Design a protein around this ligand. Structure first.
Ligand code: HEM
Ligand code: HEM
Ligand SMILES: CC(C)(C)OC(=O)N[C@H](CS[C@@H](Cc1ccccc1)C(=O)NCCCc1cccnc1)Cc1cccc2ccccc12
Ligand SMILES: CC(C)(C)OC(=O)N[C@H](CS[C@@H](Cc1ccccc1)C(=O)NCCCc1cccnc1)Cc1cccc2ccccc12
Lengths: 448, 454
């Protein structure tokens, strides 16, 4: 099965038996994709154990996989297990079950439902400032991942359920951060890749990848938040063909994503603003112009800030927390002049494309001017895909971009951030699996 | 009310009662703006009847009006009427209605939606050649505005609606026949003359169902969109407005279509004729552009989305022509409330005007402004170009929404034309070119040139 890419004439690194190319992951997904992007050109193929993975970089071919032939051929991502009851999650469900859940949960983030969340999110924006001011009055470096994580839990549990949780040591944030950490050193998610044919054994044994008492803590809490329109209400009205188990599976996804993804990116943004004060000061000047006298940000004033979008768009380029986009070829096809057999996982190296010298001038440097309306037209929509593309992109794309900018406005209105010497400069990404910094981001907070 | 610029200490020509300074328009808006720029300096004021108009030329002050204080102060243009149902047009809408329509029509001109239009526009690029080849196999002048208007109509009728209405011509197409007479702001007409001089007659004409656009042309386009709205195609301009309508209505939907039909036809054909006049009067520039097209597209290769953006000299030719001939001529914004921008007070109701034609030919920003020199926009020299002095498509949140589309449509046409033909003057060609001393920016005599096959 390791002679597939040799048959199709597609270049790639020589795979070892059983393992394939998984030993090259010692530097991580990101560094492995960038090396292969320079060695083999635009399209290459490697093996994740016995699973052939075809990497594509052509925007037209990326468009065909994610958009055009999505509902027909490239509908599902790479199979993940053992999951148990989490198989009904929209990010794990396949084919027919995904179509019914994609349309069911789509009205959650419309232009109207998002405008309803602005007065609700604005409450915790003051608790974020009032908690930062306690560690700001005094000269104590703030772990932004921590402070940012508590704010991300209140927003997702009030805009999706309507429950106030975080005020410190919160059981939701404590369990959500332990929900899943794909560590290739951890001998569980590793052997799943090399030996994917033992997943059927663990499913009939009621084994799961997510901790038991972390799922139970989230399974009984949704049953607790269900006592008699938001994300929760949109599903109970369709239940009265959801069940008492698929409803919990979607809440686990929304709570983890709304917490972990929002907090890590905001820490990535504040690092770049602290390492580039000319960008931070210029961004602080725009916030004071659209919102004078520290005016509360509304729904419309957020979409007006051009430079605030140019900074978030540039950070998501340097740190695409998804790293890769994957679609499973469900039947033999020939897209854009290339035959792709059934069973091959088509992969879009999002991290490798976001730093391509063929597309970006000085890609390693932080320059938010890449997304200015003068230079925005030079960006291909299939090379810069921080939220994916096609009918199966990020469902909370418009929600996350608003929720992060709602925090960046209220924080920069009152505080400026400086390095703390103990700040990791330059920031080392975790050479592990998920995209994160090695050392937690720490900065000095100075009130204005 | 004629002593506003006296009080503010802002210079300008002394206005006459009722008329104001509209008698100085006998040479057109362009020559009036140039003379005032030389007489009074960076800032001057005048009156369109009883309407004070403040002209600014400072890039920092222009940036504040168009970009910084757009949503708060300078959101709407000077009121235009009577318009009837066309009041809901994006170019005419105001305040909240314009903000809702701009966001609704923004995804129409993305880099992905435009890249989908290249194969469709590539069809009419060949029809443009075969119609020119007939007039080129026989020695005889040829009207560009004519051939260019037929091509521009097919591009807008198919990229926005998906309807092919000009099957290889069909020269007497009813769309082109009606669209050309949709509006010609002629100052000799006592109608548009009295509209600007006496503006309180607009509410009288509105209740009289009178419209500046003739009824026969509006009806022809009104019943055509209802004819095009069956749809039983991909995501285009007609599908985006229907998907959000399935809130828009069956006449705001037509109002935006009439705007897109006019701009895609009149603006594209007029600028293309200005380009070919400059290429025929500058054979070295035309040869240099022809040498670049054949280098990027050898063997007369079909133009694609990426090959168009790669041509650097083609962009310099289109940009320099837009400098000498900004069809917009002026940029106007209504100051909705009293402000003090860049240390200058502006009262509420004053229309701030940016003389785009005058700034493009300012001898203080351009060396030899009247001369046609594409090298101004070379990457060696483009750094010395202020984006608020050269504004052919406007600036800020209310710039030209079809800028990237019109730039691609004109470039796609110029490529497929220069690939097969070269252009020479005809003696009957007006050299030098006289601009229309009337309202809109057009030549006096139509541009005629001799077409030779390669
Ligand atoms: C900076 C923040 C975020 C980024 C960069 C991001 C990125 C992504 C990406 C790349 C995908 C896959 C797209 C594809 O495969 O084509 C995805 C899917 C998804 N995202 Fe996000 N995401 C973010 C935040 C969120 C949030 C706040 C939620 C809240 C519910 C969320 C929920 C989801 C779900 C449910 C899916 C799977 C949808 C499906 O498979 O149909 N994400 N996201
Ligand atoms: C050479 C071709 C063109 C030029 C030079 C041009 C130029 C301009 C300018 C200067 C403005 C006003 C900007 C401002 O006031 O700041 C404008 C507005 C506009 N243009 Fe164009 N344009 C062209 C072609 C087109 C095309 C093909 C369309 C197709 C739909 C179009 C649609 C519009 C619309 C709808 C507006 C109103 C924008 C708004 O009110 O928000 N234009 N154009
Ligand atoms: C590539 C391969 C085969 C190794 O692993 C996958 O293919 N499995 C992905 C992850 S499995 C599961 C893990 C999890 C569940 C609950 C809590 C924490 C982790 C899962 O359901 N997580 C969806 C979480 C929602 C989210 C996350 C980030 C951004 N936005 C939304 C499948 C996957 C789903 C959605 C987005 C993804 C983005 C990048 C990479 C993979 C993605
Ligand atoms: C300047 C003032 C105060 C006297 O009257 C305005 O303020 N009204 C301008 C134009 S009146 C209206 C008339 C019309 C509509 C449809 C067909 C024919 C005529 C209008 O909306 N025509 C916008 C058409 C789209 C277009 C045109 C040219 C370039 N690109 C797009 C407002 C205005 C809008 C858009 C572009 C303009 C370009 C140059 C000058 C004015 C422009």
């Amino acid at each position: 099965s390791h002679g597939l890419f040799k048959k199709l004439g597609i270049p790639g690194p020589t795979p070892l038996p059983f393992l394939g190319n998984i030993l090259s992951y010692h530097k991580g997904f990101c560094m492995f994709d960038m090396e292969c992007h320079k060695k083999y050109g635009k399209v290459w193929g490697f093996y994740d154990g016995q699973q052939p993975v075809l990497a594509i970089t052509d925007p037209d071919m990326i468009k065909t996989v994610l958009v055009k032939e999505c509902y027909s051929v490239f509908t599902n991502r790479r199979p993940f297990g053992p999951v148990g009851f989490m198989k009904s999650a929209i990010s794990i469900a396949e084919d027919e079950e995904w179509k019914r859940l994609r349309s069911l949960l789509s009205p959650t983030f419309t232009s109207g439902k998002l405008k309803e969340m602005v007065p609700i999110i604005a409450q915790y924006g003051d608790v974020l400032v009032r908690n930062l001011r306690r560690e700001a009055e005094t000269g104590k470096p703030v772990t932004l991942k921590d402070v940012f994580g508590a704010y991300s839990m209140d927003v997702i549990t009030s805009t999706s359920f309507g429950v106030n949780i975080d005020s410190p040591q919160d059981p939701f944030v404590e369990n959500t951060k332990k929900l899943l950490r794909f560590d290739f050193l951890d001998p569980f998610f590793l052997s799943i890749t090399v030996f994917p044919f033992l997943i059927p054994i663990l499913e009939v044994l009621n084994i799961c990848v997510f901790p038991r008492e972390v799922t139970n803590f989230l399974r009984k809490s949704v049953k607790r938040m269900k006592e008699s329109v938001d994300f929760l209400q949109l599903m109970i009205d369709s239940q009265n063909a959801l069940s008492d188990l698929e409803l919990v599976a979607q809440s686990i996804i929304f709570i983890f994503a709304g917490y972990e993804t929002t907090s890590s990116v905001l820490s990535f943004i504040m690092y770049e603003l602290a390492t580039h004060p000319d960008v931070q000061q210029k961004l602080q000047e725009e916030i004071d112009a659209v919102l004078p006298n520290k005016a509360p940000p509304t729904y419309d004033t957020v979409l007006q800030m051009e430079y605030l979008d140019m900074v978030v768009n540039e950070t998501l380029r340097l740190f695409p927390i998804a790293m890769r986009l994957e679609r499973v070829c469900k039947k033999d096809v020939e897209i854009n002049g290339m035959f792709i057999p059934k069973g091959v996982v088509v992969m879009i190296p999002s991290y490798a494309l976001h730093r391509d010298p063929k597309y970006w001038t000085e890609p390693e440097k932080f320059l938010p001017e890449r997304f200015s309306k003068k230079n925005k037209d030079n960006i291909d929509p299939y090379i810069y895909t921080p939220f994916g593309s096609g009918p199966r992109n990020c469902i909370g794309m418009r929600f996350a971009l608003m929720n992060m900018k709602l925090a960046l406005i209220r924080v920069l209105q009152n505080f400026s951030f400086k390095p703390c010497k103990e700040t990791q400069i330059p920031l080392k990404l975790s050479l592990g699996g998920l995209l994160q910094p090695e050392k937690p981001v720490v900065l000095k907070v100075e009130s204005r």
